[PDB]
Design a protein around this nucleic acid. Sequence first.
RNA 1: AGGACCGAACCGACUAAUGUCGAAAAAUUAGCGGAUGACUUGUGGCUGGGGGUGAAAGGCCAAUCAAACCGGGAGAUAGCU
RNA 2: GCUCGCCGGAAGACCAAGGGUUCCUGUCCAACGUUAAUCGGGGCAGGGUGAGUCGACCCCUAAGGCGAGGCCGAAAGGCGUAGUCGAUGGGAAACAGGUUAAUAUUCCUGUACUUGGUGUUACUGCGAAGGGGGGACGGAGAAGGCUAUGUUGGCCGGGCGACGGUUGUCCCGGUUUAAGCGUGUAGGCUGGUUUUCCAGGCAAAUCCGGAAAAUCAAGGCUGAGGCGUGAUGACGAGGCACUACGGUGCUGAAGCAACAAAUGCCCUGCUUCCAGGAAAAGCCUCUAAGCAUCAGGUAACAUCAAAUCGUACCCCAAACCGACACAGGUGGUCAGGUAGAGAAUACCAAGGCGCUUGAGAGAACUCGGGUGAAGGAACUAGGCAAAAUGGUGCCGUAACUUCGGGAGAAGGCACGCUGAUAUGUAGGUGAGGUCCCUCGCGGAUGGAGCUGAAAUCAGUCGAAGAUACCAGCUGGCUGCAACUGUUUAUUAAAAACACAGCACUGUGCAAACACGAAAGUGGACGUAUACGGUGUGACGCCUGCCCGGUGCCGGGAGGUUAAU
Lengths: 271, 46, 93, 14
Amino acid sequence: AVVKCKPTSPGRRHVVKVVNPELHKGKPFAPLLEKNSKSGGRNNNGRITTRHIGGGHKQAYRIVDFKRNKDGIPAVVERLEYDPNRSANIALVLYKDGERRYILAPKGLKAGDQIQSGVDAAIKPGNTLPMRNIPVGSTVHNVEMKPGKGGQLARSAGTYVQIVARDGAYVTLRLRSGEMRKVEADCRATLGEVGNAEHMLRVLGKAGAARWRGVRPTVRGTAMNPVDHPHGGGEGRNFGKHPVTPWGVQTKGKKTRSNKRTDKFIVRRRS
Amino acid sequence: MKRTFQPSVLKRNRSHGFRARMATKNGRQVLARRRAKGRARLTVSK
Amino acid sequence: MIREERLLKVLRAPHVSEKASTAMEKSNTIVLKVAKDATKAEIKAAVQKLFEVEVEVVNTLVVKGKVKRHGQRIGRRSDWKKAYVTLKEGQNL
Amino acid sequence: PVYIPRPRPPHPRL
RNA sequence: AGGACCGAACCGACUAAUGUCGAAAAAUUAGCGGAUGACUUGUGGCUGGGGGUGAAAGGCCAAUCAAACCGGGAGAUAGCU
RNA sequence: GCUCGCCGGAAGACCAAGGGUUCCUGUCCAACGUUAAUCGGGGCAGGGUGAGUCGACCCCUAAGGCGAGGCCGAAAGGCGUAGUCGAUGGGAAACAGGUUAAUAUUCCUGUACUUGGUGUUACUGCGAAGGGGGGACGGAGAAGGCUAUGUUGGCCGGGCGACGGUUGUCCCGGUUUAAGCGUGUAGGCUGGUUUUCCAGGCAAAUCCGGAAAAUCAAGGCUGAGGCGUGAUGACGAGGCACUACGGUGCUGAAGCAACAAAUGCCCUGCUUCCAGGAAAAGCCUCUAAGCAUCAGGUAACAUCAAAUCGUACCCCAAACCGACACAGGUGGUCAGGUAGAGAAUACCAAGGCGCUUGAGAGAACUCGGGUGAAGGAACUAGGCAAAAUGGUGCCGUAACUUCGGGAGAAGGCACGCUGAUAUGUAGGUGAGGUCCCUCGCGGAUGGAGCUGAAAUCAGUCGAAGAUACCAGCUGGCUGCAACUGUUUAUUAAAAACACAGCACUGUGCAAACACGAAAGUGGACGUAUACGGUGUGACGCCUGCCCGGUGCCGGGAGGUUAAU
Ligand SMILES: [Mg+2]
Ligand SMILES: [Mg+2]
Ligand SMILES: [Mg+2]
Ligand SMILES: [Mg+2]
Ligand SMILES: [Mg+2]
Ligand SMILES: [Mg+2]
Ligand SMILES: [Mg+2]
Ligand SMILES: [Mg+2]
Ligand SMILES: [Mg+2]
Ligand SMILES: [Mg+2]
Ligand SMILES: [Mg+2]
Ligand SMILES: [Mg+2]
Ligand SMILES: [Mg+2]
Ligand SMILES: [Mg+2]
Ligand SMILES: [Mg+2]
Ligand SMILES: [Mg+2]
Ligand SMILES: [Mg+2]
Ligand SMILES: [Mg+2]
Ligand SMILES: [Mg+2]
Ligand SMILES: [Mg+2]
Ligand SMILES: [Mg+2]
Ligand SMILES: [Mg+2]
Ligand SMILES: [Mg+2]
Ligand SMILES: [Mg+2]
Ligand SMILES: [Mg+2]
Ligand SMILES: [Mg+2]
Ligand SMILES: [Mg+2]
Ligand SMILES: [Mg+2]
Ligand SMILES: [Mg+2]
Ligand SMILES: [Mg+2]
Ligand SMILES: [Mg+2]
Ligand SMILES: [Mg+2]
Ligand SMILES: [Mg+2]
Ligand SMILES: [Mg+2]
Ligand SMILES: [Mg+2]
Ligand SMILES: [Mg+2]
Ligand SMILES: [Mg+2]
Ligand SMILES: [Mg+2]
Ligand SMILES: [Mg+2]
Ligand SMILES: [Mg+2]
Ligand SMILES: [Mg+2]
Ligand SMILES: [Mg+2]
Ligand SMILES: [Mg+2]
Ligand SMILES: [Mg+2]
Ligand SMILES: [Mg+2]
Ligand SMILES: [Mg+2]
Ligand SMILES: [Mg+2]
Ligand SMILES: [Mg+2]
Ligand SMILES: [Mg+2]
Ligand SMILES: [Mg+2]
Ligand SMILES: [Mg+2]
Ligand SMILES: [Mg+2]
Ligand SMILES: [Mg+2]
Ligand SMILES: [Mg+2]
Ligand SMILES: [Mg+2]
Ligand code: NA
């Protein structure tokens, strides 16, 4: 899993890789790929809306089933593949009716294993079923927020949510953030944590190992001039200001949430 | 020393061509100005 | 069907030069100054009728007009089309 | 002459 | 294997001389740095002025940038020559 | 015309972009050419660009543009669905010779190949804006087989050398031939086949997917090159005939082998890695409605069409961008000999050029060089600049270290040529012969040849043997920045910026945040192991006290407090 690349060149010295042997060493499934053109932060009018996005490698988008709406019909995990669009490893799965899809890999799921979705599934990891049929306190993942929506919570590597309680038609989830949210119990939720838990241990070693992940560098405020950024200019490492984003809104502690149309579903706020 | 005008008929037209003018309103006003001044060559569409 | 009132329009003049000379000499090709559009089939039929001689292939090109500084004024000449007509075997002028 | 070359900087008599 | 080493193409511009009404509105000569990559390049496209873009120098945005260029307000205003 | 010099991974040859007659011929020297000009990319006139196969066009899509209706917007207008454009990519097909003053894969000769139209000929389920397959892909590495190509040998032709020798393991030249068709190789991948069933492929489908069970162990697809043919043909060193003195008409020998060998082809292959590597059509099948003598499909033959535009010329340049015939810039392709690791470099081939002012002189002084007595940094701000070092093989190699490095540390030794070991070695390559059988482009053996290191021993020459070109100066202490990188195009390349790493903080998804009056879009087709912002800047040891102030976060009990 976690390997330390030998310091046989500066920039190779610090690298820590995740050499997953079990990952499929071949081409991904054809009918489930589609083109994923890069943007670089830019949008309709063409302006950099999100700074620092740019460059990197081409990647095709693997159509992962997040909905898990194929009830009853069992399925076997053909193989586990590396997905450049995610931090979790995808799994090409085949249902008994010759239809093959992608799912996220829970922690304990090798190839050859078997899983199936719907209300009457078992509670083995990989199985999806509404969060009314899932027990209390079990750790699930790929959680929905609306019945039929698709699954939005706990989609990243090593992440998972926990059903703290079900009070009527609503389940309270100790979200991976530590926030206690409260959604409908009729929202399906894949069981078990997400795999690739050793994702957060890689260290990328050098600047290129990020530049090809597609992150142009971030220039500090202080370096910039007064016109470029609130922290600006000076005769050598001068700040005297209060930390704010390039648009003068306070960073380093300022709650910037205002929904008023969902604040009722948050049991308790973040930790 | 690399100068500024690196000619290319494709870009030249797509930027200042006749249909590039007549596309939008401002371009058609540019054409109107050219015709009011009475120029020989309205646009650059050699 | 291609009308006589167009075949009488296609052909304009027979080009004369060293190249037209040697072409008529060695390859049975008469060189003509044909109209602007003057498609190969149009020229084919127009010669097959107006000259009543037998055509094999028509090979055509468009020469561009020179720029001519008549006096002190930059002029130009019309771009016209020259067509090589390889007669089958017989004869022509 | 539509191009007007800039003058060379004067000696810094500060 | 490697933002690995030496070193041409290629990319650049550290030193020195020349050049400074030049051969050249930034170059030549001798060297010099990278040279499988955060590299370089072709073609086309996108972002436009208080706007763009910026590995950030107020840099670049047509030999012009502490706010482009063109036209208009405009014969601004100028207790200053 | 003869010498001389230069280039030759270019200053040669062919294109693209760009230019637009600059191409060729005749005529002229007013202007243009930094001089002269008979010359010219100059002036005037005439000629020249021939395509089923090359490109465009056209079919298909990328980024992206426009965008019915649509959503939004004081107006203009913005976004965007269906859709339609858009190559820098995907999609059918021609080669070798001959020719012009100038075009030629376009003309001519020969040899082909592609796609459709139509008609007859039979046999047949055909049928799509729909399904499936395909096209369809990264970086790096390595090896095997090849080829281009060159070298030598063998032939063929010619020569017997301006002064020594030169009919001999002597000299010079040529020894070339394509596409297509047949073959199916080195080699690459893949089990194959028959039935039967099925909640998948928005319906269907025999196609795909998926199960079963038998099935034979083979097949299928891909495939460089070679071989045969193309070709009793062309080309051909040259010889002769006539000279528009330019070249035309004929005749025209040999036209093999080995070895070396690509950065090119097999190979989009193989192995491997993480950074996870366009799409759509053409293509092949499946069926839907509709029709099932028909239509339509396939095959065979015949025949027709392949239109339109480009094609001259420059293209690291006097023709494109730079105002100039400007020491600048300009993408792609080919790349020969000797020496060499090499596309470096030196000298050369093909080929091109002598840079559009020259002639004298041989003052100072300036520029580019060469050498230098003795000293050797005393110069100077500073060893700036020069000088010096420089290669391959082996020996040897410290502190420190993050254990990799440092390190090419430092330093030393050998290097030419000749002969022998060895009538050239080890090695490579491999004929003939022979045997085997899947009988062949087969395997085993076999070694003729053809190449060909490296080492040792002996000798010899010179002042010097990595002899030219080319080609590290070395070490010690230290500040800063971890490092590779980026930066003020055009006086600043750094300690500045970035960086991987660390931290705080925001953000629960219709996320935060950002562009946008809004629709919307980016974030992200991502989901707290994620994204944004801010600071710090690998790594090691660490980061101490202060919340008075400003800010941020949390409270709401009290005072004040807006519109109303
Ligand atoms: Mg960022
Ligand atoms: Mg950072
Ligand atoms: Mg930064
Ligand atoms: Mg400010
Ligand atoms: Mg400062
Ligand atoms: Mg200070
Ligand atoms: Mg023809
Ligand atoms: Mg390197
Ligand atoms: Mg190097
Ligand atoms: Mg240089
Ligand atoms: Mg280096
Ligand atoms: Mg500028
Ligand atoms: Mg201003
Ligand atoms: Mg005034
Ligand atoms: Mg006024
Ligand atoms: Mg040429
Ligand atoms: Mg002219
Ligand atoms: Mg000429
Ligand atoms: Mg005269
Ligand atoms: Mg003159
Ligand atoms: Mg002329
Ligand atoms: Mg043509
Ligand atoms: Mg639109
Ligand atoms: Mg289209
Ligand atoms: Mg193209
Ligand atoms: Mg020519
Ligand atoms: Mg060969
Ligand atoms: Mg010989
Ligand atoms: Mg290479
Ligand atoms: Mg696709
Ligand atoms: Mg029929
Ligand atoms: Mg040509
Ligand atoms: Mg000149
Ligand atoms: Mg020049
Ligand atoms: Mg060479
Ligand atoms: Mg050279
Ligand atoms: Mg000169
Ligand atoms: Mg002198
Ligand atoms: Mg001497
Ligand atoms: Mg001395
Ligand atoms: Mg001395
Ligand atoms: Mg001193
Ligand atoms: Mg002194
Ligand atoms: Mg020096
Ligand atoms: Mg010297
Ligand atoms: Mg030197
Ligand atoms: Mg050096
Ligand atoms: Mg100090
Ligand atoms: Mg540094
Ligand atoms: Mg550096
Ligand atoms: Mg500068
Ligand atoms: Mg810092
Ligand atoms: Mg502190
Ligand atoms: Mg306090
Ligand atoms: Mg407060
Ligand atoms: Na405080």
